[PDB]
Design a protein around this ligand. Structure first.
Ligand SMILES: C[C@](N)(CCCCB(O)O)C(=O)O
Ligand SMILES: C[C@](N)(CCCCB(O)O)C(=O)O
Ligand SMILES: C[C@](N)(CCCCB(O)O)C(=O)O
Ligand SMILES: [Mn+2]
Ligand SMILES: [Mn+2]
Ligand SMILES: [Mn+2]
Ligand SMILES: [Mn+2]
Ligand SMILES: [Mn+2]
Ligand SMILES: [Mn+2]
Lengths: 308, 308, 308
């Protein structure tokens, strides 16, 4: 029960600043106290400091940041600690997943997101890297990426070993890429049809039929409906509700196989208050903004926090 | 893949004006662009212009309008186009359903509504025709209706060939009429028990056991909860949520048997903004009012719009 | 079809006043008219007037009030009327359940609440009695309670004959007490997994396998999410939604075995307006605050109010 905390305040994968503030905000709201009360020990590593495609915005900053995160996380993973990577925008998942994958070759990835993040640079409508991160991680890029030379000999994630859950806002080209690469995906309609519980069980059975693989959770908070998670940059209607996202994290915790996790796209500057109700019982700052509080609660779930 | 668009701005079935503005509002919000992007071709026909019961309000206007709609829609139906009838209050469904039924004798009707609209004039607490339209269409009226002589020799809809879905606000007398006429109905409690997916599958199996009948969808937007669809005149708590109504329309689209549809009771004057989030990706006007945007999205669903 | 109405305006089980106003507020909103329209007859009894543990706040007032409620309710129960006990905070459930249990020895209790209310005085973080009421009723208290001598020879409720439904905010010690006493409990996660319908059927099957026992419903309105029930003192995120709580009450009504019920923790001073929509059809005051209106609707459900 040891967790390494890595702050990855990268904001270069998308237009806005805001997400660079997420790591320190969650600490301020009570990350350490929450981990403590759940009976885990932590080591907080602090924050990461900071022929070719030519159409990815801010790629130099992203590439240089990613090398640093990769090296730092590799070192934490070797301790056999659970590693919690707090973004930052979703661009931080590249180094997170690949570092975990080099150590855990049979890693299975659960990517929880309103979006596919599976554009390649030639299909992206925005040129924003956080909308391409999963495609990059899956080895789908067709040319070299500036400032990513350090990554060129790594083993990439396989689509059949990945499940994307919660998606509802996919670009025209992404729809094609999604079907073509044969990744396992579960849309909000699948969830409405079958329920979140059946959905995650189906996904886990599909990617880990023998229930014996390490799991990495990459959680984009915009998977959650805006009613509960307004503090995020790219909102899509009809998201996971409060009960659903909490249950999803609980079920993943109960596998006992989660080895690493990203929590990304939390933007405190866009967050709002309820605020404080009696049910906010975790040692989280009274009256905290609701998305930040939800992030801490979902981290608690992964660490075993349960109702009874 | 051809759709005829008919604007039916009838507001005489209920107290308020507002719904007469719906047709042009949806055009302004991007109806044509939405249809175009989905790979359909449209023909926009424009807007319909405008011993006995003596207790139906505004019946002259309704009767005269209905003759015009019946004649106009009959002509579009003969083209074998999908026909989209945009109200207007629900009173427009009489001519819509009966014109479609004369052409498609084995038509099956899915009536999606918070209400039964199945009062007869002698049981109506309001005298408002939009609360009687389904009863009229089902041949339940017991006396002649002024200005409906043109309709007296038509074949009427049969209750066993109809399913009402989403109901939750039914008048005392309506409850009796509903049970008596043996229509198939699925309340919000049935939906809460079984889920929207099982519910529509059950309904379709009940009215079209051989999966071989043309389908008409009569969608009253007040079936949807006020949180998502405030722009409507008669609100009932506990409606379909955003995910549910989208899934329902998707499942109906996937039958490949929908031949005509009403979208009624949208009142732009009562609508509100979110507004614009990234997920609003259809070519719908940025920052559109939320009910209008939802209407366009649900039309998109019927035309095949899907997440992946 | 006779109901005795007892107002139990006890506010001493928790810090705030407010709940003492609930009984008269529901009468003002139309309790009598609602009962009348459902074809029931009522008798409104009015309002109840008003070695040892030394750490229960306000226990003298609570103990003296409880003797009065016990005596008053015992008398109503003997009439073989359905007895409706309107709080007041949840402290009123002690005398309510025990009086009903002395008469109906095979009583089964369905406790609907965001909370367990199953602290004992030595584990309570607050010293507030309304957070201990279920533990007291279950005979879990280990010392005598001041001003409860009148209750010392009563038969107490058994955990195996009880089901708690909707829970989500449980204290650390409560979690242990809950597991230890072997009460049947169904958390909001169980409800999210299986749905409210399967959940209540499972609970009823567990505590009343032969479907032949009288049922007492103890409904704390804070079981319902704040979106629908803001008028309550102790809010917990992720509660039952409007559709769920209505369906739950309907299913319990349909057993035909409910003999008594508490409706507690409604605090009009914390309530808010929508307000009035067409769907508010019960004879409830136009524009009533939403929690009060919901309380009346849920009482209607127990008395047989249904959609069709
Ligand atoms: C338009 C879009 N698909 C948006 C991606 C959103 C990134 B995320 O998961 O927060 C793109 O820029 O590629
Ligand atoms: C009271 C009422 N049942 C209301 C009908 C609502 C019409 B609708 O579906 O928008 C009536 O006037 O008959
Ligand atoms: C902290 C708490 N568990 C709160 C109990 C809430 C009572 B209720 O069901 O409304 C306690 O005071 O024991
Ligand atoms: Mn993402
Ligand atoms: Mn996203
Ligand atoms: Mn209608
Ligand atoms: Mn309606
Ligand atoms: Mn309680
Ligand atoms: Mn409670």
């Amino acid at each position: 029960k040891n967790v390494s905390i890595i702050g990855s305040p990268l904001a270069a994968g998308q237009p806005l600043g805001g997400v660079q503030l997420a790591c320190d905000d969650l600490r301020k709201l009570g990350l350490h106290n929450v981990i403590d009360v759940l009976g885990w020990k932590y080591e907080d590593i602090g924050n990461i400091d900071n022929c070719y495609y030519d159409n990815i915005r801010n790629i130099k900053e992203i590439g240089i940041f990613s090398k640093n995160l990769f090296d730092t996380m590799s070192n934490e993973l070797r301790k056999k600690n659970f590693v919690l990577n707090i973004g930052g925008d979703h661009g931080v998942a590249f180094s997170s997943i690949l570092s975990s994958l080099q150590m855990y070759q049979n890693l299975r990835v659960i990517w929880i997101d309103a979006h596919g993040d599976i554009n390649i640079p030639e299909t992206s409508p925005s040129g924003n890297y956080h909308g391409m991160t999963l495609a990059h991680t899956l080895g789908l890029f067709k040319k070299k990426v500036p400032y990513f030379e350090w990554s060129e000999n790594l083993t990439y994630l396989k689509p059949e070993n990945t499940a994307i859950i919660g998606i509802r806002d996919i670009d025209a080209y992404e729809k094609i890429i999604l079907k073509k690469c044969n990744i396992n995906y579960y849309t909000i309609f699948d969830i409405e049809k079958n329920g979140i519980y059946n959905t995650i069980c189906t996904a886990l059975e599909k990617i880990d039929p023998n229930s014996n693989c390490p799991i990495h959770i990459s959680l984009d908070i915009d998977s959650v409906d805006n009613v509960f998670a307004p503090g995020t940059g790219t909102v899509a209607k009809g998201g996971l509700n409060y009960r659903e996202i909490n249950l999803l994290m609980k079920i993943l915790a109960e596998t006992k196989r989660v080895v690493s996790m990203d929590l990304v796209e939390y933007n405190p500057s866009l967050d709002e208050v309820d605020k404080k109700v009696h049910g906010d019982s975790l040692p989280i700052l009274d009256n905290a903004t609701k998305t930040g509080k939800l992030c801490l609660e979902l981290i608690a779930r992964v660490l075993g926090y349960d109702i009874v």
